[PDB]
């Protein structure tokens, strides 16, 4: 009966509940209690882009640690050089309303979407020397959160229904759908080794999920409402969320559960992006107060505050080679800090 | 600086060059965001997969709609995407007392409606935006409380079964959700199948609300 | 992707000529276009440089004042004017379109060029005239430069082209390292400040002509003498 199914269900629940505590020993705060602290870090504004005429929603660091990618409130895809300053192309977009965006590892295909309801995908190396429409993948109901590039192949996509998509570029066809989720997917991310890929959602929890089997491995709950930035760690057993409660969250792969929480009573306000620093010895999340906070990742300590934005951030990202950090807000201007 | 790097910054020039001449356009025009109980009335109102755009013009300005009824998502997470638009329509159909649990659960159209309205005109965003709500269903509504008495909702009286105060009672019961009644204002039109002044009344409302910025921005207002 | 040439021919001095290039296939109006002139006999040297939007306008110092060129964005038309037509100049002309970005491969596509017949400076140095050679061999071709071509920046600015009997020249490797597109990858370049080398491995047909080295560090461009191979 109906009646049986759940309760067997809570019985279920309360296993995984008393597993994971009997998988516990200490905690990580308590372990990280005998190494020095990265004292105060003090990074500094080198380059300022100030090409846009809108908000800034999405951004992407290239492969090379050179080229950038960032999207407006009007047909607006621009790519930046971050040395020089000088911007290289200036895409248009169909739909004005976007809120996402990715550089493939090829440096060959850029991706858009947002309300519009469909992804983008753009190519960059063409004869003509213009930016032409690739393809124009269909089929979600609601809206796009994030899309990222597997290959120059493969991309995946978290969309406004409660659902995940993995398509092919050649045909226009959904290769994949990944439907567990309870609420609207807000982030994105995937694995260094390209097999595995978190999914953030808005019912307070983020799903594992395996990229070619097609079934979830692992559900992490905990935080007390919507989360809408999670990245990877760079060994790939260990990832942080951030919600709109005013704390990050740490969870390990392997054991199953949360270690970590990053939350002062000082700020109050929301998360918007979340990204690793490369030795994972730093954490940095974007709030909604206007600034741009660093954490250290093995001891819940608060580092020095990049505060240099007129409102709210809405992305941040760090280069593959860990030189610097870029961050754009809801003002027109992004910045780079080294 | 070597020549590939100054015909690069060249091409950046000309990049801002044409950046800055599509905003500049861009910025002469006025947006208005419409929303309405399903299909109560909007389809007329547009008559003269995901958001569906407009773009009429009337009068030496161009317009720009936006019909956002088919998301079916949570609107909160995505509302702020629109907080610079000049104005929100707002589409009530006048028919909708009585024609009981049109929803699934067992509610008038009238309550969800009003919901609705509460939860767009006292918004955190919308903190400074007017609304130019109209009455659609102007001639059924003549029918409806001719054949039937305004009983299955508002327990207080409607003085009688006449259009006239009919209509004032809703119009006064609609207005009157909003809390800062100083910081923005409601039009109240009432409309029909065959009028042809709608527009004339959304260019007046919207000349309305662009000079009120102009003097707020001026530091007089 | 198509650029074709007009209005040469036999002239007597002291007239006046229009040279038109007509562009199909591409987006003229990012692109911008240089005038190179080749002797009957004689190796590569340049005549004229126009930059997107109409801004910069390079001549050489032997043109200068003589030649004025000009283009028509609508139309997709390049006009280049000759003045005061002297004997020097009877010869075969190009054009060649051109883009600057990072990561961009200037000098990429060469048009088939027009015939006109009539009745300091960085200085090249190519070390050989001629190379006999057969199939499964590898060859190595080398440049030289008067004065360090590595700016500043980390970059390196040569250009390596090769003409084919009866065909206009394209593109090998650009900035002394890269690969251009639709090529083998049997070519390979290297070298340091003031030595290039060009080197080819498992030579096949279709391979013979001139291969041309080309400098892009300040301008008037200046190119090599001429290296040949011979089966």
């Known amino acids: 009966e109906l009646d049986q199914l759940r309760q067997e269900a809570e019985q279920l629940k309360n296993q995984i509940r008393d597993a994971r505590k009997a998988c516990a020993d200490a905690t990580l705060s308590q372990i990280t209690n005998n190494i020095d602290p990265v004292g105060r870090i003090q990074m500094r504004t080198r380059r300022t882009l100030r090409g846009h005429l809108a908000k800034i929603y999405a951004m992407h660091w290239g492969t090379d640690s050179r080229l950038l990618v960032s999207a407006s409130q009007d047909g607006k895809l621009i790519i930046w050089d971050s040395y020089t300053t000088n911007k290289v192309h200036a895409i248009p977009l169909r739909s004005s309303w976007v809120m996402t965006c990715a550089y493939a590892p090829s440096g060959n295909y850029v991706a858009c979407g947002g309300l519009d309801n469909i992804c983008s995908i753009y190519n960059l190396k063409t004869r003509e020397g213009n930016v032409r429409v690739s393809r124009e993948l269909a089929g979600h109901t609601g809206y796009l959160s994030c899309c990222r590039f597997l290959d120059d192949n493969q991309i995946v996509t978290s969309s406004g229904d409660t659902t995940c998509a993995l398509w092919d570029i050649e045909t226009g066809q959904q290769t994949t759908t990944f439907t567990g989720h309870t609420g609207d997917v807000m982030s994105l991310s995937l694995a260094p080794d390209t097999r595995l890929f978190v999914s953030g959602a808005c019912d307070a929890s983020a799903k594992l999920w395996d990229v070619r089997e097609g079934m979830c491995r692992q559900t992490f709950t905990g935080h007390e409402s919507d989360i809408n930035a999670i990245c990877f760690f760079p060994n790939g057993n260990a990832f942080a969320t951030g919600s709109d409660d005013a704390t990050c969250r740490l969870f390990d792969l392997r054991a199953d559960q949360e270690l970590m929480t990053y939350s002062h009573d000082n700020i109050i306000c929301g998360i918007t992006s979340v990204s690793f620093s490369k030795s994972g010895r730093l954490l940095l999340a974007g709030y909604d107060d206007f600034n741009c906070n660093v954490w250290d990742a093995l001891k819940a300590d608060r580092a020095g505050v990049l505060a240099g934005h007129d409102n709210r951030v809405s992305c941040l990202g760090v280069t593959d080679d860990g030189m610097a950090v870029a961050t754009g807000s809801w003002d027109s201007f992004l910045k780079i800090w080294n | 600086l070597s020549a590939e790097d100054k015909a690069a910054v060249e091409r950046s020039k000309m990049i801002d060059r044409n950046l800055r001449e599509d905003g500049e356009k861009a910025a002469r025009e006025v947006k208005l965001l419409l929303l309405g109980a399903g299909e109560s009335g909007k389809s007329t109102i547009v008559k003269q997969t995901g958001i569906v755009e407009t773009h009429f013009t009337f009068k030496d300005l161009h317009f720009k709609m936006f019909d956002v009824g088919a998301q079916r998502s949570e609107r909160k997470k995505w509302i702020h995407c629109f907080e610079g638009v000049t104005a929100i329509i707002f589409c009530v159909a006048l028919s909708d007392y009585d024609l009981v649990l049109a929803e699934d659960e067992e509610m008038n159209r009238m309550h969800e409606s009003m919901k609705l309205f509460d939860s767009i005109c006292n918004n955190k965003w919308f903190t400074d935006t007017s609304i130019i709500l109209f009455l659609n269903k102007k001639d059924l509504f003549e029918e409806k409380i001719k054949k039937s008495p305004l009983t299955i909702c508002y327990p207080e009286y409607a003085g009688s079964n006449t259009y006239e105060e009919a209509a004032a009672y809703i119009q006064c019961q609609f207005e009157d959700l909003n809390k800062r009644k100083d910081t923005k204002e409601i039009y109240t039109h009432f409309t029909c199948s065959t009028d042809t002044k709608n527009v004339q009344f959304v260019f007046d409302a919207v000349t309305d609300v662009i000079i009120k910025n102009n003097l707020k921005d001026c530091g007089l207002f | 992707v198509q650029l074709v040439e007009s209005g040469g021919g036999l002239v007597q001095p002291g007239g006046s000529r229009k040279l038109s290039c007509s562009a199909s296939?591409?987006?003229?109006?990012?692109?911008?276009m240089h005038w190179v002139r080749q002797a009957p006999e004689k190796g590569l040297e340049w005549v004229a440089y126009?930059?997107?939007?109409?801004?910069?306008?390079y001549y050489a110092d032997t043109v200068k004042g003589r030649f004025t060129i000009s283009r028509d964005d609508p139309k997709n038309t390049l006009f280049l004017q000759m003045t005061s037509l002297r004997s020097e100049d009877t010869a075969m002309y190009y054009c060649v379109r051109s883009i600057y970005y990072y990561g961009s491969s200037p000098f990429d596509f060469w048009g088939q060029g027009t015939t006109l017949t009539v009745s300091s400076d960085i200085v090249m140095t190519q070390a050989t005239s001629s190379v006999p050679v057969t199939p499964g061999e590898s060859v190595s071709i080398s440049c030289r430069s008067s004065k360090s071509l590595l700016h500043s920046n980390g970059n390196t600015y040569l250009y390596w082209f090769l003409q084919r009997p009866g065909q206009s020249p394209q593109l090998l490797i650009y900035r002394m390292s890269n690969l251009a597109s639709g090529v083998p990858d049997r070519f390979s370049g290297s070298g340091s400040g003031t030595a290039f080398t060009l080197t080819i491995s498992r030579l096949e047909a279709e391979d013979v002509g001139v291969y041309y080295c080309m400098q892009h560090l300040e301008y008037p461009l200046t190119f090599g003498a001429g290296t040949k191979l011979e089966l």
């Open positions: 126009i930059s997107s939007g109409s801004g910069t306008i």
């Open positions: 296939g591409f987006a003229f109006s990012s692109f911008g």
